[PDB]
Amino acid sequence: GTQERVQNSNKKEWNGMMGELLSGQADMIVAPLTINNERAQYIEFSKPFKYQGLTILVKKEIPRSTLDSFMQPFQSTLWLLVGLSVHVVAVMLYLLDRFSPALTLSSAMWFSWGVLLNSGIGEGAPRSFSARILGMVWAGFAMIIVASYTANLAAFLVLDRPEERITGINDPRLRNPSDKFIYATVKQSSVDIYFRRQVELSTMYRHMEKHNYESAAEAIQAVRDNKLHAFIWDSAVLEFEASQKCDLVTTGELFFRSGFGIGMRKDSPWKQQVSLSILKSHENGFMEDLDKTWVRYQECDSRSNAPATLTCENMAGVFMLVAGGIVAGIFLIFIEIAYK
Amino acid sequence: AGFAMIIVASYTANLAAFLVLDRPEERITGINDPRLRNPSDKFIYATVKQ
Amino acid sequence: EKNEVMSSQLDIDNMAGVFYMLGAAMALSLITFISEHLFYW
Amino acid sequence: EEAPFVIVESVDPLSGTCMRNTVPCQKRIISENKTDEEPGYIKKCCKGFCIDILKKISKSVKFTYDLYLVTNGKHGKKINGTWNGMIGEVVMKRAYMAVGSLTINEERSEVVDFSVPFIETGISVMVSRSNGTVSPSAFLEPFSACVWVMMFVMLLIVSAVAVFVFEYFSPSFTIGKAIWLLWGLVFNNSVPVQNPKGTTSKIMVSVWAFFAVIFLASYTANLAAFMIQEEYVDQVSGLSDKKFQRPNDFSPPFRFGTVPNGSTERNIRNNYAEMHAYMGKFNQRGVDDALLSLKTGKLDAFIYDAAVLNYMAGRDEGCKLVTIGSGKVFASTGYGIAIQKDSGWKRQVDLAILQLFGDGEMEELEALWLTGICHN
Amino acid sequence: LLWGLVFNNSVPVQNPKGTTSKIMVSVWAFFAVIFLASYTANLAAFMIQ
Numbered sequence A: 001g002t003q004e005r006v007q008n009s010n011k012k013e014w015n016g017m018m019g020e021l022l023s024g025q026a027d028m029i030v031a032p033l034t035i036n037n038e039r040a041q042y043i044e045f046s047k048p049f050k051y052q053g054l055t056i057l058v059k060k061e062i063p064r065s066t067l068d069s070f071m072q073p074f075q076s077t078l079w080l081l082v083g084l085s086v087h088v089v090a091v092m093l094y095l096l097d098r099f100s101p102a103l104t105l106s107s108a109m110w111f112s113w114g115v116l117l118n119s120g121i122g123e124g125a126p127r128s129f130s131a132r133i134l135g136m137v138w139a140g141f142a143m144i145i146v147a148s149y150t151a152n153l154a155a156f157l158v159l160d161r162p163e164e165r166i167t168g169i170n171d172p173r174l175r176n177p178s179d180k181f182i183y184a185t186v187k188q189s190s191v192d193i194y195f196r197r198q199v200e201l202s203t204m205y206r207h208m209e210k211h212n213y214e215s216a217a218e219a220i221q222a223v224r225d226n227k228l229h230a231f232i233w234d235s236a237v238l239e240f241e242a243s244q245k246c247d248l249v250t251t252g253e254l255f256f257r258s259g260f261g262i263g264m265r266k267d268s269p270w271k272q273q274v275s276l277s278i279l280k281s282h283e284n285g286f287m288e289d290l291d292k293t294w295v296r297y298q299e300c301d302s303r304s305n306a307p308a309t310l311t312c313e314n315m316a317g318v319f320m321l322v323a324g325g326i327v328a329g330i331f332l333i334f335i336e337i338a339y340k
Numbered sequence B: 001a002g003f004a005m006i007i008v009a010s011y012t013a014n015l016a017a018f019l020v021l022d023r024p025e026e027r028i029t030g031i032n033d034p035r036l037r038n039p040s041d042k043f044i045y046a047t048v049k050q
Numbered sequence C: 001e002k003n004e005v006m007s008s009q010l011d012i013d014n015m016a017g018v019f020y021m022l023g024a025a026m027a028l029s030l031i032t033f034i035s036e037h038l039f040y041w
Numbered sequence D: 001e002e003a004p005f006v007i008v009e010s011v012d013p014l015s016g017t018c019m020r021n022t023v024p025c026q027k028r029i030i031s032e033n034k035t036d037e038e039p040g041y042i043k044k045c046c047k048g049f050c051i052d053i054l055k056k057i058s059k060s061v062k063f064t065y066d067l068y069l070v071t072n073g074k075h076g077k078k079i080n081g082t083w084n085g086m087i088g089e090v091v092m093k094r095a096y097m098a099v100g101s102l103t104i105n106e107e108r109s110e111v112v113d114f115s116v117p118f119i120e121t122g123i124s125v126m127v128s129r130s131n132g133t134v135s136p137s138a139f140l141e142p143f144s145a146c147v148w149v150m151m152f153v154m155l156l157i158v159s160a161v162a163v164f165v166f167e168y169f170s171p172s173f174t175i176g177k178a179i180w181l182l183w184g185l186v187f188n189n190s191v192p193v194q195n196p197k198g199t200t201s202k203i204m205v206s207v208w209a210f211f212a213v214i215f216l217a218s219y220t221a222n223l224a225a226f227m228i229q230e231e232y233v234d235q236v237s238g239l240s241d242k243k244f245q246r247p248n249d250f251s252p253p254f255r256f257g258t259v260p261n262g263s264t265e266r267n268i269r270n271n272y273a274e275m276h277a278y279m280g281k282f283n284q285r286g287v288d289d290a291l292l293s294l295k296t297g298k299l300d301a302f303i304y305d306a307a308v309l310n311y312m313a314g315r316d317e318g319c320k321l322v323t324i325g326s327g328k329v330f331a332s333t334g335y336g337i338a339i340q341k342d343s344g345w346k347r348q349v350d351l352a353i354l355q356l357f358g359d360g361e362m363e364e365l366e367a368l369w370l371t372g373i374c375h376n
Numbered sequence E: 001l002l003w004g005l006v007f008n009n010s011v012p013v014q015n016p017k018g019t020t021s022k023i024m025v026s027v028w029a030f031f032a033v034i035f036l037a038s039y040t041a042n043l044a045a046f047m048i049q
């Protein structure tokens, strides 16, 4: 519907569905026609059978692990320092054991190197009183290191929230736009008129129409391939478009409370009869049945930010490490054969 | 042994999850608090008369 | 509330108290060894 | 004054009348009896959403008004072919209009006229926030089915390589002893037999123990991260859950009820019979008393229009009482301002409400009188 | 033995066939594993915030 005006005839006329309605050839609108003060002047509507609105839409992807490798939490210098400290404490245990009045150095180093990574081989443990008071604290150090490790990696695995989902209209979209994500709507639409209506919404509409689109399906496709980040349109349309592909979900909250309604011709008894019948239908589960049957096919939401599962992509570092260890052992068996 | 490992792992996660979701302060951030919305009988707030 | 996003690391400066205690324990083991060696004498 | 859209302020003690902001609403109510024409006129004041919208209508459409507060008979219900309360006063030409919460309905629209709905509502159900829950597969959740199978394949091949190469080509180390050793070394130490003096075998065991301790650390970390962030889902629904169609399923006292002489009451009456009977078996008192009984465990659910329930569940602190899901209506009709039959003011108030909707004034009025505390 | 049983296992010599000594060692190991669990839990809770 459009109230197109021009100076050729100095008169404004309705051209479109409402034009055909007022022309006399049509009888009543059964299309999903919105309501407003403008269209209520010429014709009169009935009681609504739905409550639509405008909600933002945004693409939704599985959360992802985020951990590059196992060497992430502490450092490289931290591992180097702890290794050299293992070596230093092993040689110090050996020095304190033989000097006092029996750890052969190899066995003491094996004991040290085993009691940091929680087991391994090598019975044998210092019998020198200096070493006995040394190790205890070394076991304590290893316990502290291990405890600090899992707390730190678990603290990093619970403070990773890369979504920052748009909660509504009180978001930085209203404050100031940026160049990272974009937001606009289709030109020459009712949403564009409502945006050009208000004061702050006028600046929002300017910043949006700076790069606005001109189609609904094209905007959907652009959102599907990350071309455009978010576009505003009628609630029911995008609500149906979300539950049909299960690739993008809706967001924000509906604030514009204009619902659809049967458009009747002015001053007809069918108007009143129609309002009483649509309200009765709204009560007996009829509208709810039609909603659950026609537009709401299946609840494919699975929303509410399911936590990060870890996956065969971050432990790949540890698998490569154990493979390199296998290779090192394949070399070391021959090295030891030659040495013996 | 697997069962014991799972039990121990579930134990420390659950006690550490309960030791990090305990925030009994609920400090009053300003004038946009329930003090403006509606008072209660738990805590009181007023000033000196005149 | 400015949620504290503590996605940081642990460098040598971020954690040195454990190494300080390890050094203190090394010193404690060394003097005890010296004390025992003097006690035999 | 049954809804948080128009409140009843007694009087401002300074001016001898109401305050400056709200509009005074006279109370022409018989205090105790109708023996004489004593109106009991107390200078009360009505503030809120409906009063603001009435003020806006009066500012746009120039007309004077006086508030005949209540007939004090009902919220509106057909009794022996006669309406009472607001509808009863608007049908007998005693007030020519009405405002507040009517909740537009077919039965009401049969006699009295109505304007366009200015706010959404509907039959809803508010239940308390039950204690937190967790998935029964929490132990298997924090690691994919890929890590487990890859770890077993690597375990098998490592045991095989270790045994065959290191053992022979260096009380014997067979494959069973080695697989038991590895499986105990990864799962928090049972009791194996130590490998022989083979240096390469020892190095392999050390690397496997490092892998095992790192696997256990990652498992515990991602399990704590999985357990910390867990929530519930919702209740079931309004018209579902055969336990509602058969209250003998489990725990028969699944307490729920409605206030009599209301829209939801008549809706359940015309729609259901057994549900209506079981609801009347657990009839409750007024909205405040009903919420108090719900908060004290005596009640389990409550049925009321969406606006009042949403306002109460969002305004109360602690977030103990919420609604099912993210908020779903089942009989959404909407509120409205009642209008005398065949009155010529319907079109004017209709256009006024429409242009106010287009002006975004009610968007601000919502934050002015509808926002809560648990909107976080 | 006790100091290694509380700090993530070094290498002790097992106690004799004494049943009461074994029960004491078992109770001490339970205390140790609970102490380590509480330590790690309150350390993660300390590090996150």
Ligand SMILES: N[C@@H](CCC(=O)O)C(=O)O
Residues within 6 Å of the ligand: D075, D076, D101, D102, D103, D261, D262, D263, D264, D265, D303, D304, D305
């Ligand atoms: N608004 C209803 C009362 C509340 C309800 O039935 O939910 C009425 O005017 O009758």
